[PDB]
């Protein structure tokens, strides 16, 4: 109890001359509260179950109708030395590792590379599950982006970025903003539940840090009444995530022309939104306008660094994209 009071220091989060007692829910006005963010976990569980239903009953028949391979991986040829190396040394040999294995086994590099690729495919999930997951991600990202566009088209802060800090902290909470924030937090918690359980043996790096940072930002911005600028970030970031899933779906059906086109479009949208628009527009409204209109708050040192972290992430992935696009030309 006392440690929670220490953590929620009103002189750290809220700006000068502002107390939590000012943001309590009164008769005529409703303000966002931390207690409203507990529904996110139940909604994430409901989303997880709906995802399971969609994958097994809606995506699998479509994959069957599109000649996706319904069987598992292939079987690697038997080899004692290769099996010992795969179980002991590593699972994804590099060029130097392939050369060393060829020297040790006195075998061609192509055969060892094919054997290790087959073993990796055995360890990797089948194409059917990846296709179903990509279809679910595409549908959810398209819904979220469309709802965000419909919500933002009427708001006064999309055109002028100095309207997110208009009457701070006295900005009432609307149904649309609450629904958008709860839906986003629920989706991120659903991704969490899916990753710590179903995929605890797949990936736990850049996308787990990305998820954690996104949940951190969404929660602490919602508690701090700094949510008008968060909708612009959520809608900007979800613009490009609806094309990568379509490109993956085109890839998994062995369509390379559509996959190449959709990936050139995803690359263009990703670069334009997350390298040209995001820093100049959102970090402008965040680093300088927020501190000018709202005043000196210390939470700014936490929030901008995190957004800069996100920007670093979204610059690494863009190098990864610029080379694939070079391969796609």
């Amino acid at each position: 109890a006392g440690i929670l009071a220490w953590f929620w220091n009103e002189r750290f989060w809220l700006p000068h001359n502002v107390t939590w007692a000012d943001l309590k829910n009164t008769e005529e006005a409703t303000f966002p509260q931390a207690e409203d963010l507990y529904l996110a976990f139940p909604l994430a569980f409901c989303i997880f179950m709906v995802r399971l239903i969609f994958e097994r009953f809606v995506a699998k028949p479509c994959a069957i109708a599109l000649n996706i391979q319904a069987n598992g991986p292939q079987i690697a040829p038997p080899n004692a030395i290769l099996e010992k190396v795969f179980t002991a040394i590593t699972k994804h040999p590099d060029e130097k590792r392939l050369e060393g294995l060829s020297k040790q086994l006195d075998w061609d590099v192509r055969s060892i590379q094919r054997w290790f690729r087959q073993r990796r495919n055995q360890e990797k999930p089948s194409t059917l599950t990846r296709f179903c997951e990509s279809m679910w991600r595409f549908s959810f990202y398209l819904y979220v982006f469309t709802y965000g566009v419909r919500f933002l088209k009427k708001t006064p802060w999309l055109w002028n970025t100095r309207h997110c800090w208009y009457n701070y902290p006295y900005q009432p909470l609307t149904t649309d903003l609450h629904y958008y924030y709860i839906l986003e937090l629920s989706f991120y918690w659903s991704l969490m539940f899916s990753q710590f359980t179903d995929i605890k043996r797949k990936d736990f790096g850049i996308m787990f840090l990305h998820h954690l940072v996104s949940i951190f930002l969404i929660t602490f911005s919602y508690v701090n009444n700094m949510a008008r600028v968060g909708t612009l970030v959520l809608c900007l970031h979800d613009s490009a995530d609806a094309l990568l899933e379509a490109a993956k779906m085109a890839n998994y059906a062995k369509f390379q022309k559509m996959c190449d086109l959709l990936f050139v479009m995803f690359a263009v949208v990703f670069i334009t939104t997350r390298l040209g628009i995001f820093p100049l527009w959102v970090l402008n409204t965040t680093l300088f306008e927020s501190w000018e209109i709202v005043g000196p708050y210390p939470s700014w040192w936490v929030f901008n660094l995190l957004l800069l972290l996100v920007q670093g992430l979204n610059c690494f992935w863009s190098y990864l994209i610029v080379k694939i696009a070079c391969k796609a030309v």
């Epitope: 708001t155 006064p156 309207h163 208009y166 009457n167 006295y170 900005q171 009432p172 209109i293």
Partner: nanobody, 123 residues
Framework: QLQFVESGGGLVQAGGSLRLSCAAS????????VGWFRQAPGKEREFVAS????????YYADSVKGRFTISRDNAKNTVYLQMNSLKPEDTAVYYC?????????????????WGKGTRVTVS
């Protein structure tokens, strides 16, 4: 409903200076942003000026800048619009309004809890 009552109006000679007051019978007038709107005869309501809860931002109309000033006193719960160098355009009925979702726009449909309205006459 914090129904406003605009007072402070009469007839002023041209090139004059007149102060107007809007009084709110409520306890939560200090959290809201308020605005002053005018309704020209045989015309629709226009946006004259607006002010936030703590006087941080004062938005004006492109026709009243400099000439018109808006201020508010939280303890008294009153808003004071000082008009200066009054031209004949100012002749209308002024209504004091309240902003409902802190949107910062220039619109008649975002402002509720309107008032009966005070009248100004400019020669």
């Amino acid at each position: 409903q914090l129904q406003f009552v605009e007072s402070g109006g009469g007839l002023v000679q041209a090139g004059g200076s007149l102060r107007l007051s809007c009084a709110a019978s409520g306890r939560t007038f200090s959290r809201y942003a308020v605005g002053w709107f005018r309704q020209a005869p045989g015309k629709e309501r226009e946006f004259v000026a607006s002010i936030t809860w703590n006087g941080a931002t004062t938005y004006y109309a492109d026709s009243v800048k400099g000439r018109f000033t808006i201020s508010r006193d939280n303890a008294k719960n009153t808003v004071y619009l000082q008009m200066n160098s009054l031209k004949p355009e100012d002749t209308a009925v002024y209504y004091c309004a309240l902003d409902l979702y802190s949107y910062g726009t220039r619109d008649v449909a975002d402002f509720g809890s309107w008032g009966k309205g005070t009248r100004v006459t400019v020669s």
